[PDB]
Amino acid sequence: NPWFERISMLVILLNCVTLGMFRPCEDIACDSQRCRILQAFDDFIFAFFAVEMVVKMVAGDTWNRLDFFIVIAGMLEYSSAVRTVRVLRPLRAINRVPSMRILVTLLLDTLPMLGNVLLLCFFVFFIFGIVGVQLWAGLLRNRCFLPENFSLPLSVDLERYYQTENEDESPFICSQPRENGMRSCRSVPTLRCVNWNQYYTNCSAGEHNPFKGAINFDNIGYAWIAIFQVITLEGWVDIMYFVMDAHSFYNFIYFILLIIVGSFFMINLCLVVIATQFSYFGRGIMIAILVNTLSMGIEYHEQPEELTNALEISNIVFTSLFALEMLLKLLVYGPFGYIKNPYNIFDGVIVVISVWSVLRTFRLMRVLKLVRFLPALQRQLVVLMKTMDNVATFCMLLMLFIFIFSILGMHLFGCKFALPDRKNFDSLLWAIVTVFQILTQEDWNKVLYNGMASTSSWAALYFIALMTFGNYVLFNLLVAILVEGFQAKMFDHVVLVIIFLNCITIAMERPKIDPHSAERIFLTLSNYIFTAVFLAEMTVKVVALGSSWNVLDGLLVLISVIDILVSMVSDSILGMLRVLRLLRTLRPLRVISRAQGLKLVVETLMSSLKPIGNIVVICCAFFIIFGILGVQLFKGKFFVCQGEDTRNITNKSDCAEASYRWVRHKYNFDNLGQALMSLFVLASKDGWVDIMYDGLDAVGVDQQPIMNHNPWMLLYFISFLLIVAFFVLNMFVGVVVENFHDLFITGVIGLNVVTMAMEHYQQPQILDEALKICNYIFTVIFVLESVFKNQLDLAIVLLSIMGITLEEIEVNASLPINPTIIRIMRVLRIARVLKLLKMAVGMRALLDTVMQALPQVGNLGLLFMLLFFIFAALGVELFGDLECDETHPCEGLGRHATFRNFGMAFLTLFRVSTGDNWNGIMKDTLRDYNTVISPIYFVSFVLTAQFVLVNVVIAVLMKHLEESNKE
């Protein structure tokens, strides 16, 4: 019936409210009358569904089966694992709503097309999963340990190793003597009496891993947690810094390789496979409305009374300048004819609100009336609005997914965590925020370590399944939108070898250079020579030829010439020279002009940029509106005072009595200039949570922040992320859519793969025997394949039969070789896994497609490297003297990431590019004339790195996409 449809959707949605209120802390029932009422509600719903199923047992087939399955579980449940099962109850609804029968059907129909991509992932997880366990097995456990003969006195109460101030986040991991770790022993700080830190010489294994028990490399189970965290690019750096302490500094290659293979090449390959499968008077008012809005953006905490008053007066004059047009438009036009054109209705509503807090805030709707004068924006907005219908279903589908997972997360770890941590799963409202948080991947791993250490280490499957299937229904969204769009002489070379030699001097520069040594003397008179050569080169092109690229080349030579004529005048200022040095780091840009392949790509990006250029203005407009709106809400609010106590304190007048310092948060909403930076850490999606917390804690202009003072401010930040993400998605879509217009042997190998995963840390003697004994078997069978007779297989066996020989020689043959030679050889048995590459015909076809499009990518890749060269060089100049001793604490920069070289400033620029804690880096370049420069350097780098990385993905998409079309 049409009315049989609503009896079901009444009791399915009645079910959710009985799941919505869980109150997990209050376990074992009988808490209140309401709890009993909720229990009573359950019986009615369960009784009704069984009866409904029976009516249908009197009479989508797949969907019908699912309803029966949930019902059977419910009956069994009535007869704590069973209790969590209830959550599935909400899934009955997918069949009920038609708009979801279809979407889900498509989702479920795409999985057999991701057969190949999934297969590729296993190779990546397995290959890097074993190389981790071969190398860093139980390496993380070690700590400085006493020399174990002498026991310290009872009175001192020291632990027995070196504990840091926070042993859960940053333990002190010493490096074994047989290894070369960065953090060697005896580097421990003097104790704050006798200093016991001077007696921590021995370094040996300890019971606990670095983050709770979670970050660890001593099973194949615990390696795949850490590989999954590197691939999701969240907190990946923390892992690499522990490896570099325990086992050398050359371990960075493993991580970089993992990231440009697992994290970029593979995660953005299941976007490619999933989408290739489908295939005069009015001109005066425009000046008036702009200067009204710009009149709003001049707030700024602590403005003088002469300015607040002027602004108030200004508002009054403007209102009459809009009212008397309304009066004019109500007299030169008729009253009925005024209403009919629909923008004239809206422009009169703003007048009535103006004449008559919320009203004060509302003034920001006055920019809206400007779209009556822009034809292009008017057309653009409608197109954007058209996509909402397609988007609404997925969002509706997404809501069910968050609800289910926020309900499930209450059952597993509801009241286990930690006062409790802010990201906790108890109260529902803070469970849906935590599940929305993991879907933006921002500190999803800080919740993992509370999750794994509270229930069990098998609780990573809750977070693997929330991140995977949350990101799988978000890749579909891009594709669904995307599909709809588809249905509507030698001179150049010779001078190039002078620039690449020019780069080496730029790279060489660092602040720790003596003014009189030979590194200094070489850099001064290589400046003279290069400038002269370039200067000579410039005339040749102008006495012969008598253009955009040339001016850039021309400007650079002039700047260099000017630099010498202030460097000569050094005796006779400093400020001009500093500006020149930064400008002098733009020398690398010359390379683009010389290379034709590279040159075309740079021009091409600009042309590609134009179609979505218009949308950017709309996106830009939103930042200003939320920038002004944001400023009004928290002008004096982000003043948090730091001390050791931070209790019994409410005011600046109280926090000065105890002598605690007052800290204005680095990211605050004081000006429109600061609010526009703090809305870039929100938009970036990194560190948005840590901004959001003090936006919820914000109380008053001179007050101390109260935790969770106003949880209604979640609407200011969560709603901002869902329209930044929406706008960014549209821009990506716009750019793409305009371009268009045996069987024994394999089994034997499989058996071998399982055996290599058997190894762990402190495996017993017999499994060390059996594993070794087993190897002697698989060595024989692969020779028996080369008897029975591809080039790689011959090479593969050679490594094997070589390995058995080396290991054996050491025990009873002769003097051993160095252990390092043996260890490398053991790893090289992983090459046997590559042979099953041949069996997978499908993976190779999918894989080659990337190669065909590789040449376009190569130019982009070259461009990406050039951009790190300019920024890295630039970075060293600005941030050379930042340091991190005990007197200067630093948040993002540290021992492993500094800007004091060109090498260390090249690794530091890589984790800004992946997006891991770059706001902690920008937070402490500010901590010491740097307030304007430092946000320009970190905002313009991120928007130009991510924009090159987008143009790679859409270039791999196009070549791959074209294959499907020919058929």
Ligand X SMILES: CCCCCCCCCCCCCCCCCC(=O)OC[C@H](COP(=O)(O)OCCN)OC(=O)CCCCCCCCCCCCCCCCC
Ligand Y SMILES: *[C@@H]1O[C@H](CO)[C@@H](O)[C@H](O)[C@H]1NC(C)=O
Ligand Z SMILES: CC(C)CCC[C@@H](C)[C@H]1CC[C@H]2[C@@H]3CC=C4C[C@@H](OC(=O)CCC(=O)O)CC[C@]4(C)[C@H]3CC[C@]12C
Binding residues among 662-701 for ligand Z as defined by CB under 6 A: 671-674, 676-677, 680
470 binds Ca ion (CB under 5 A): no
727 binds ligand Z (CB under 6 A): no
Q: Where are the alpha helices (DSSP H) in 443-517?
A: 444-454, 460-486, 491-508
191 binds ligand X (CB under 6 A): no
How many residues at the interface with ligand Z, by CB under 6 A? 16
C-beta closer to ligand X: residue 144 or 225: 225
- Kindly tell me the sign of the dihedral angle through the C-alpha atoms of 577, 580, 584, 590: negative
Task: Return the SS3 of 306.
Answer: helix
Residue 467: C-alpha distances to residues 436, 447, 509, 873 (Å): 10, 13, 43, 37
Out of ligand Y, ligand Z, ligand X, none, what residue 127 binds, judged by CB under 5 to 8 A for its kind, is ligand X
Q: What is the number of other CB atoms lying within 10 angstroms of the CB of residue 677?
A: 20
Contact between residue 902 and residue 876 where contact means Cβ atoms under 8 Å apart: yes
C-beta closer to ligand Y: residue 149 or 965: 149
The contact mask relative to ligand X for 814-853 (x = CB under 6 A, - = no) is ------x--xx--xx-xx----------------------
Q: How far is the CB of 162 from ligand Y (least distance, A)?
A: 13
Q: Which of these ranges, 255-263, 275-283, 870-878, 913-921, lies near Ca ion under the rule CB under 5 A?
A: 913-921
Q: Which of residues 846-875 bind ligand X (CB under 6 A)?
A: 865
C-beta closer to ligand Y: residue 645 or 848: 645
Out of ligand Y, Ca ion, ligand X, none, what residue 417 binds, judged by CB under 5 to 8 A for its kind, is none
440 binds ligand X (CB under 6 A): yes
Among 623, 727, 868, 879, binds ligand Z (CB under 6 A): 623
Q: How far is the CB of 29 from ligand Y (least distance, A)?
A: 35
Out of ligand Y, ligand X, Ca ion, none, what residue 653 binds, judged by CB under 5 to 8 A for its kind, is ligand Y
3-class secondary structure per residue, 631-688: HHHCCCCCEEEECCCCCCCCEHHHHCCCCCEEEECCCCCCCHHHHHHHHHHHHHCCCH
Q: Which of residues 286-305 bind ligand Z (CB under 6 A)?
A: 297-298, 300
268: left (phi over 0), alpha (psi -120 to 50) or beta: alpha
Out of ligand Z, Ca ion, ligand Y, none, what residue 915 binds, judged by CB under 5 to 8 A for its kind, is Ca ion
Residue given tokens 């500006």 in the structure block: 579
Q: Which of residues 233-292 bind ligand X (CB under 6 A)?
A: 248-251, 253-254, 257, 261
Contact between residue 553 and residue 590 where contact means Cβ atoms under 8 Å apart: yes
Q: After which residues is the chain broken (C to N over 2.5 A)?
A: 59, 79, 192, 279, 356, 418, 488, 546, 572, 741, 789, 928
CA–CA gap between residue 917 and residue 780 (Å, rounded): 50
Among 131, 364, 383, 598, binds ligand X (CB under 6 A): 131
Q: Kindly give, in sequence order, each residue whose CB lies less than 8 Å from that of residue 690, ignoring residues fewer than 6 positions away.
A: none
Among 470, 892, 915, 935, binds Ca ion (CB under 5 A): 915
Out of ligand X, ligand Z, Ca ion, none, what residue 673 binds, judged by CB under 5 to 8 A for its kind, is ligand Z
Residue 860: C-alpha distances to residues 451, 709, 813 (Å): 41, 48, 54
C-beta closer to ligand Z: residue 775 or 913: 913
Residue given tokens 């102008």 in the structure block: 542
598 binds ligand Z (CB under 6 A): no
C-beta closer to ligand Z: residue 264 or 300: 300
Q: Which residue is nearest to ligand X (CB)?
A: 903
Going by C-alpha positions, the residue among 139, 247, 268 that lies closest to residue 184 is 247
Q: How far is the CB of 422 from ligand X (least distance, A)?
A: 12
Q: Which of residues 212-241 bind Ca ion (CB under 5 A)?
A: 234
Q: Is 967 exposed, middle or buried (0-12, 13-18, 19+ CB in 10 A)?
A: exposed
C-beta closer to ligand Y: residue 173 or 833: 173
117 binds ligand Z (CB under 6 A): no
Q: Rule CB under 6 A: which residues touch ligand Y?
A: 145, 147-150, 202, 204, 645, 647-648, 650-651, 653-654, 812
CA–CA gap between residue 200 and residue 308 (Å, rounded): 62
Q: How far is the CB of 259 from Ca ion (least distance, A)?
A: 12
Q: Kindly give, in sequence order, each residue whose CB lies less than 8 Å from that of residue 345, ignoring residues fewer than 6 positions away.
A: 339
Q: Is 490 exposed, middle or buried (0-12, 13-18, 19+ CB in 10 A)?
A: exposed
The contact mask relative to ligand X for 356-395 (x = CB under 6 A, - = no) is ---------------------------------------x
> What tokens does 305 get?
């009374």
Q: How far is the CB of 265 from ligand X (least distance, A)?
A: 10
Among 51, 903, 928, 931, binds ligand X (CB under 6 A): 903
Q: How far is the CB of 76 from ligand X (least distance, A)?
A: 26
Work out the end-to-end distance of the chain between its first and last CA atoms, rounded to an integer number of angstroms. 45
Q: Which of residues 900-939 bind ligand Z (CB under 6 A)?
A: 931-932, 935, 939
List the Cα angle 191/197/199 in 5-degree steps.
150
Q: Kindly give, in sequence order, each residue whose CB lies less than 8 Å from that of residue 707, ignoring residues fewer than 6 positions away.
A: 697
Q: What is the number of other CB atoms lying within 10 angstroms of the CB of residue 345?
A: 11
Site residues (vs Ca ion, CB under 5 A)? 234, 441, 686, 915
